[PDB]
Amino acid sequence: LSSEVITQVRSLLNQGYRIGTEHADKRRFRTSSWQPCAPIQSTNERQVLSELENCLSEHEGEYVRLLGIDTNTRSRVFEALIQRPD
Amino acid sequence: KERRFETFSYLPPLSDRQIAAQIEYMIEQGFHPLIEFNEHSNPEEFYWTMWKLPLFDCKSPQQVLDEVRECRSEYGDCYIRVAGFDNIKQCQTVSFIVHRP
Amino acid sequence: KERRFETFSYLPPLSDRQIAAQIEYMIEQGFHPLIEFNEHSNPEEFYWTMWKLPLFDCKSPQQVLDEVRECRSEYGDCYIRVAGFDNIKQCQTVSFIVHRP
Amino acid sequence: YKLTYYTPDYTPKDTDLLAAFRFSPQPGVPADEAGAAIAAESSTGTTVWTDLLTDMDRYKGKCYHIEPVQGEENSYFAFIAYPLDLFEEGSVTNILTSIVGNVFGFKAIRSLRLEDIRFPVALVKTFQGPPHGIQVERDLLNKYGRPMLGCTIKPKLGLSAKNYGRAVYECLRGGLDFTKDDENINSQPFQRWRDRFLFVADAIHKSQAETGEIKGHYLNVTAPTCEEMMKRAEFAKELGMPIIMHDFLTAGFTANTTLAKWCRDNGVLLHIHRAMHAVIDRQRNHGIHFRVLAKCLRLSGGDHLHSGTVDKASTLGFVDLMREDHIEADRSRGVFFTQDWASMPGVLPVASGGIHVWHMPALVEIFGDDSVLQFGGNAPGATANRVALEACVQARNEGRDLYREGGDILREAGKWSPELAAALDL
Amino acid sequence: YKLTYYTPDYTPKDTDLLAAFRFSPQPGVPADEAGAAIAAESSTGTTVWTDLLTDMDRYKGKCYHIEPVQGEENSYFAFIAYPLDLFEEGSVTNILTSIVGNVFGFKAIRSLRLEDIRFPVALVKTFQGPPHGIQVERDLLNKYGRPMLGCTIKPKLGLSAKNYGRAVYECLRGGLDFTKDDENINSQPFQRWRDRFLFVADAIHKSQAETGEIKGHYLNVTAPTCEEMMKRAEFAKELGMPIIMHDFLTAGFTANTTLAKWCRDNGVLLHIHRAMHAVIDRQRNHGIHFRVLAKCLRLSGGDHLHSGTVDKASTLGFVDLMREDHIEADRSRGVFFTQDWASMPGVLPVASGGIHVWHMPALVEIFGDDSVLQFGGNAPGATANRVALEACVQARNEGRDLYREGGDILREAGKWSPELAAALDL
Amino acid sequence: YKLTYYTPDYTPKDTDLLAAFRFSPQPGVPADEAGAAIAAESSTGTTVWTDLLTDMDRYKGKCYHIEPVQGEENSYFAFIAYPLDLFEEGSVTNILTSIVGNVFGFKAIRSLRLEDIRFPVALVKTFQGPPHGIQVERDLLNKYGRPMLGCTIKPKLGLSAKNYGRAVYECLRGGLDFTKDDENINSQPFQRWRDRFLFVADAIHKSQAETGEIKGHYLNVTAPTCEEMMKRAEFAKELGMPIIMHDFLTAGFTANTTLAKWCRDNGVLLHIHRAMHAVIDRQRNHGIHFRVLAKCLRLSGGDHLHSGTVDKASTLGFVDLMREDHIEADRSRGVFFTQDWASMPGVLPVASGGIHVWHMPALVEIFGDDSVLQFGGNAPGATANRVALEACVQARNEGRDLYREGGDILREAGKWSPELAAALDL
Amino acid sequence: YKLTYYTPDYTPKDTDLLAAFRFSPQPGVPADEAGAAIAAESSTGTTVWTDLLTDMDRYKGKCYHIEPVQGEENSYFAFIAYPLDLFEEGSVTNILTSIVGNVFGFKAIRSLRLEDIRFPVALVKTFQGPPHGIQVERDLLNKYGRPMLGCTIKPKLGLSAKNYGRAVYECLRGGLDFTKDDENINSQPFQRWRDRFLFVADAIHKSQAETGEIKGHYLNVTAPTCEEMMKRAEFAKELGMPIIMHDFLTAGFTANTTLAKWCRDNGVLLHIHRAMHAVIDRQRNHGIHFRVLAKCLRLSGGDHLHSGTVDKASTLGFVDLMREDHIEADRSRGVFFTQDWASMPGVLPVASGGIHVWHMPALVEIFGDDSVLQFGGNAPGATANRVALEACVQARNEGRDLYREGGDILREAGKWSPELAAALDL
Secondary structure, three states: OOHHHHHHHHHHHHOOOEEEEEEEOHHHHHOOOOEEOOOOOOOOHHHHHHHHHHHHHHOOOOEEEEEEEEOOOOEEEEEEEEEOOO | OOOOOOOOOOOOOOOHHHHHHHHHHHHHHOOOOEEEEEOOOOOOOOOOEEEEEEOOOOOOHHHHHHHHHHHHHHOOOOEEEEEEEEOOOOEEEEEEEEEOO | OOOOOOOOOOOOOOOHHHHHHHHHHHHHHOOOOEEEEEOOOOOOOOOOEEEEEEOOOOOOHHHHHHHHHHHHHHHOOOEEEEEEEEOOOOEEEEEEEEEOO | OHHHHEOOOOOOOOOOEEEEEEEEEOOOOOHHHHHHHHHHHHHOOOOOOOHHHOOHHHHOOEEEEEEEOOOOOOOEEEEEEEOHHHOOOOOHHHHHHHHHOOHHHOOOEEEEEEEEEEOOHHHHHOOOOOOOHHHHHHHHHOOOOOOEEEEEOOOOOOOOHHHHHHHHHHHHHOOOOEEEOOOOOOOOOOOOHHHHHHHHHHHHHHHHHHHOOOOOOEEEOOOOOHHHHHHHHHHHHHOOOOEEEEOHHHHOHHHHHHHHHHHHHHOOEEEEOOOOOHHHHOOOOOEEOHHHHHHHHHHHOOOEEEEEOOOHHHHHHHHHHOOOOOEOOEHHHOEOOOEOOOOOOOOEEEEOOOOOHHHHHHHHHHHOOOOEEEEOOOHHHHHHHHHHHHHHHHHHHHOOOOOOOHHHHHHHHHOOOHHHHHHHOO | OOOOOEOOOOOOOOOOEEEEEEEOEOOOOOHHHHHHHHHHHHHOOOOOOOOOOOOHHHHOOEEEEEEEOOOOOOOEEEEEEEOOOOOOOOOHHHHHHHHHOOOOOOOOEOOOEEEEEEOOHHHHOOOOOOOOOHHHHHHHHOOOOOOEEEEEOOOOOOOOHHHHHHHHHHHHHOOOOEEEOOOOOOOOOOOOHHHHHHHHHHHHHHHHHHHOOOOEEEEEOOOOOHHHHHHHHHHHHHOOOOEEEEEOOOOOOHHHHHHHHHHHHHOOEEEEEOOOHHHHHOOOOOEEOHHHHHHHHHHHOOOEEEOOOOOHHHHHHHHHHHHOOEEOOEOOOOEOOOEEOOOOOOOEEEOOOOOOHHHHHHHHHHOOOOOEEEEOOOHHHHHHHHHHHHHHHHHHHOOOOHHHHHHHHHHHHHHHOHHHHHHHHO | OHHHHEOOOOOOOOOOEEEEEEEEEOOOOOHHHHHHHHHHHHHOOOOOHHHHHOOHHHHOOEEEEEEEOOOOOOOEEEEEEEOOOOOOOOOHHHHHHHHHOOHHHOOOEEEEEEEEEEOOHHHHOOOOOOOOOHHHHHHHHOOOOOOEEEEEOOOOOOOOHHHHHHHHHHHHHOOOOEEEOOOOOOOOOOOOHHHHHHHHHHHHHHHHHHHOOOOEEOOEOOOOOHHHHHHHHHHHHHOOOOEEEEEOOOOOHHHHHHHHHHHHHHOOEEEEEOOOOHHHHOOOOOEEOHHHHHHHHHHHOOOEEEOOOOOHHHHHHHHHHHHOOEEOOEOOOOEOOOEEOOOOOOOEEEEOOOOOHHHHHHHHHHHOOOOEEEEOOOHHHHHHHHHHHHHHHHHHHHOOOHHHHHHHHHHHHHHOOHHHHHHHHO | OHHHHEOOOOOOOOOEEEEEEEEEEOOOOOHHHHHHHHHHHHHOOOOOHHHHHOOOHHHOOEEEEEEEOOOOOOOEEEEEEEEHHHOOOOOHHHHHHHHHOOHHHOOOEEEEEEEEEEOOHHHHHOOOOOOOOHHHHHHHOOOOOOOEEEEEOOOOOOOOHHHHHHHHHHHHHOOOOEEEOOOOOOOOOOOOHHHHHHHHHHHHHHHHHHHOOOOEEEOEOOOOOHHHHHHHHHHHHHOOOOEEEEEHHHHOHHHHHHHHHHHHHOOOEEEEEOOOOHHHHOOOOOEEOHHHHHHHHHHHOOOEEEOOOOOHHHHHHHHHHOOOOOEOOEOOOOEOOOEOOOOOOOOEEEEOOOOOHHHHHHHHHHHOOOOEEEEOOOHHHHHHHHHHHHHHHHHHHHOOOHHHHHHHHHHHHHHOOHHHHHHHHO
């Protein structure tokens, strides 16, 4: 994980926002086709960060996009493209 | 007479080796093949007769060759085409004759 | 005879107090009170004439009151109307008569 | 189905079309697998050689949340996301077909109800929308400062055209802003549409002449065919009438959208009625909730809609789903989703239902400035109604709480007002 | 209510419309007083000064029978009769709004469901009816002595219009008689309407050329507005498309009536689907029942109508209602009165939803030649479909009872039909 | 200014539009205030009484990023976001008028060049976009897996219609698919447009007859007047012409968009030309960069577009930008943001300007199969060109690096192609 | 190329077309050969077989004069002649593509411009030219003895319809002759075009009633499509307006030539805005100078044109080009060629940009009577601005020098005018 993503997820968690991730290959990515990733059911920063890095490792060489979720509103509040295949 | 066709027609009649090379590129491209035949060939006529399915669980060219040779044996007076299609792209990426009567 | 107008026109002629109170209303909700007149009243005539501004730096009702008194002094033979705009909502939530010749 | 149509983790995109279910699965059917199915039968329907020439994954309904219904048994809340591409541009009928067309028949679900849909700002923009909206409509009418009163001419039928213009004449001239046709008045043989329209137009002309304020009547043009609609609407536009009537339920969304696009082209307002409304949202166990319809209509386009008399919670939920530009997601109000709208002009709700003139203080405190209130009848009665409105408004602008002192205000208005006294007595 | 409305001693006339409701009163509300209320909410609603200017009794809908439901408690039928003057001529929408426009919402009834209508002759014959009629339809396709075959392309979405034609073509060439566009496919970004139409027409013509048999596809013409739908349909006519597909519930009836009339003028078969009917009719106790909808549509006009995969008795009941010229009252099949159409032609029922071709012999024995069926997929696949049809019909004709002999027929047929041999192994 | 317009803390929304300016301020004007002044210019310009009747904040361009250009002095990028209400739906025109209506005319910036825009999906959804798309164009033309060959008719003027169709035929029969009307040819007195249309039509038909390729000619329809452009357009479809050509710069955007829409209604491909562009883009330090123009057109709608003979990297950037559905921000290729289309279809790129067919392999590699190459003219020459293309694509299929082996390929192809051998000899 | 395209001894025929190029070649390239290349690229481009089938020479762009720029290095002036044949009739667009279609892509010129064109009188007469002309305008409006005054309404966006027309009324009543939109303001979400026409017409008619002077606003009818623009302009005439607005760089020349024909046919004034002119004129090195565009536009047809606040010689040059029938060549003023117009009427200049009423007496000096002054604003300000207009004209007519006495005129006028005193005190 990069410093700038770490500081992002920090800010996200501090507000009380949940964490989600979505993955897709370079073709899927082109077609704006994302897929669900395994749940990060933890509000602790360490556990979130560890599960993010595990998910990144899971999907080597595929686009990964990080997001911010307000559970009360059930709606998106932030978009961000964290990783790319190269 | 001077009758050509869509793709690779102006090169020498494509031969089993070069068919194999082209089939291989099609395979590693990941586009699941389709073969197709007819009695005649009309541009204004969009659709030909596919070879009873498209091939989806394709590992080797040599099976595609066997099928083409079969569909010659049944339709030796018809034209046989190979077509390749990207789903993700939603674009027909390959379409070239492999037989003439 | 019985000519009406759009809001409060039915009611008895608004005395100063109720005009003030409604100015107040506009003030809490930030409807800066816009004073306009016409020499007659016909529904087809969308547009009337302003009293030289809308009163954006109104800290009190009495100032707009006193304006309308000036206006009556100069065009007492005319009708006077007052409006308030929700620039945030871009909506005219207010228009009503405070004078008649 | 679960393994491909149930995506608990799935975060629904800004551009998605989000849909909120309340379903009750048949015994033996788990909630999760019920939601998966509900997803599947609404978008795909289920190894045909045709499928692998396609991107199935790209168009799938991703059911991303299921949650049990509070304080009730055998009912769960499923949220399904749908790509924006799944639905045709300009077409309410399209999204309706794609959403609420087939999954309604899926036997395994005992009981099924879609409740909300998040209309992404993008698919919002696309539509002609309403023809004038709240504020432009108020301006065209010159009417500000109070909700727009309305009265239903009676009897529903039988009246001659000439008498139908007598009735409009009285009702409007008493002081009332518009008068509405009965939905069962279109061309009927005792009253032919052209004569109705002519006569009414005369009557509004006179009434507006002698009061000097905007008058209109919701002259229904619902005709069996587009051509006939268009003819009655054109000839109405020759008459200087500010508004018409269309029954979007019983006419249809397509007819409505045509009419509205014409009206926007034509500078004439648009009224809607909801005949059969109950047929779709009444039961507590099945249907689509009236909010999504009001939202759909505003989408398709209209300047006026009925919302009833006054559940109040979700009532004002949909009032807000048809008035504001921005509303936050609120469960308790029915607003299952957040709704951004790119400044699309809002719509004016039409309260109705024999509104019981004395009930009006709460009605106004509910509906505020921006609304239309409609009376299920004589010129003094409208005089008293107008009086009372102005007074109630007046008191609300004072800061007094209409709730508490509604009878007291109506009273205060009563002593100088004969006709208001004659009414309050009744 | 029970005093004026409720006329069990009244004689209904041939000039009057009847409506059938299965209604369960709210507790405290008796059966009779509820049936009167149901009469009231739909005819007159409920004193003003316009009342005495009219003859009120001229314009009252009359309930003339109540009885409790067999095998159910507190459920009763209010049989209700109406004048002829009430309605606009030839207006589905008008009638709908007259009857069902206010009755569904009144609290006094817990689960009302509109079961069946009886349209008087004089009213019935003001329409155009279905654009040709089963007999002319069958003459135009030139196909006799057997039901017809539709297939709905799969998968629903992502297919290129080029693939979409290519799947059509396989469908028809293997011996199908129709492909059907899906109700959702109207202009999606991944297929725009016009390309699709062009490629379907080319595919139809080439399938015709190879096969030697007339071919038709169900081109969707539901379009967001009247102008799109008009253009679209014109374009299809330009390609000589004999048949089209419209959705009527979301689109409504006004637009379907326009399309039917235009098609009358232009020779064009009108296939129909019922998308969103499951909203309105699935629930047993509340809603409106599909035969009403079918009867309304058949007034408006449509060559085809879907009626379900399949109560088998109520199914044939309203099947009959849509095919034959005159039907009698049959409660065992759900038919409640005796109807006359006075020479307005029939509409084909269509079967869908996994018709399972080893269930084919039951399908024929249920309906027979005068219907259409729809399979859920290849040229060989459609050839086996075809072979099964033709063996089934043959065996029917021979006097062999299908019901018992199915799997033997299919067998025998498969012995000489390798393609049917595969379809039976699967 | 910088206080009011420059907010480095603001996050751009998906609902906001972005504009990239490579700006060098006038001496004495700091970069930050310079960006402030730019932001002020393009939306608001910069008191009056009217000003406090609105919400300035709702209508405020925001610059959230300024940075000095690497390896340049006094040069910086202003990235300025823009709300979702400033513009009208579906009008390139209004856009350019808002962004570039006066910003270019300001004093403080010595040169300003608009590098990039980023449309919000909401606006992207409101146009019609390209009539068909790359995929659908390839479907109509039935040609797949390679780029497209076009040749322009020389000399640009003087040729008689008879001559001009001779040359057409020869270019086409020799194996080129497309023929280009040199830009200035519209109706010149030596060549009346209508006689040109007919002769092309009859040459293309007969070419198609001999060759057994679908042909197409590029038919410039750009007209003095809207009526005239339309007429010539009807008469082009009336001969079954599948493709036409128009100018979006010189003729403009309202005409192009009207033509695209009509084409959409009439099933005709629409090629574009870029004429007058290099008054706007040649300057690296002032004007507009062609990625913006392309992007605007691809909103407007067009099948093809010129993109140059070939910066390589920036080429690829805006190339992939006009073909690809979603693109990432990358500065090396000149793409400053991450974009999505929400499924608006692609445009083929076009190159021209003396393509030197022994340069073909690099051209195929850099472009690929989705492009069209346009060549500055005999049937043998077209034969050689087509051959060299077919050999190149084959070889690329083989996995042979094009760059290294182009010359050996061409030679091997020529050893059996006397046409190509001769082409090589020169 | 020089031996083909450099003819120093060539006399241009009056039937030719002369275009003046400022150019800086690449190092090494001689100036004469560079200008030969610039000639060749546009008239012929460049060998092919077809070329000898025509008269090469007849279709050539002849460099007959080259000189360096006085007091400048690596710069020169080219004059090129083009035969009348090469061009279409009535197509400004054709002109722009021939002259400036591709030449600014030619590599060897480091920088290029076109300074001026001389349109042969023959080629002139094919265009309709301005719809009415200065004199016909000035008669129909009735306005004499002064230049005209305009107030661009502010704020550009956000303003509601109702408020919009309010402010139009105000400012118009103050004594201003017209009002404009910002070029940006046609149908933004906050504001719909049709309602805005309707409001504006009410305001104008009220102003004209009360003031007793022809009032008008500049009605931006630019629309995404020729159909829309036609629509909006037809509508605007229905209401009885005298003038409209439209924008040529943005929307397109063709749409202009259309709109000018239609307004010519329907007796409506046309006003023009020049948004993006900066993107073609600003720099001193590369673009097309504004004068050329103004020349082209008056060809196309218009009644007003923005011309800046006000190099002063250039301003006076092209305003006179657009004003007078005959102009004599003047390189100090930048008029490269003698021009005639065979009495084709002129166009009204427009200057705007917060014109500083203190500088207004200079502006009357510079421009002369036949002009329009726009003002980037309330009823009293508009009165003070009119009375200053008076006072300055009157003084001019007294024989007092405007430039020397501007301050004395203004103040003396203000001694009797509170509104002008107030203005001056700012």
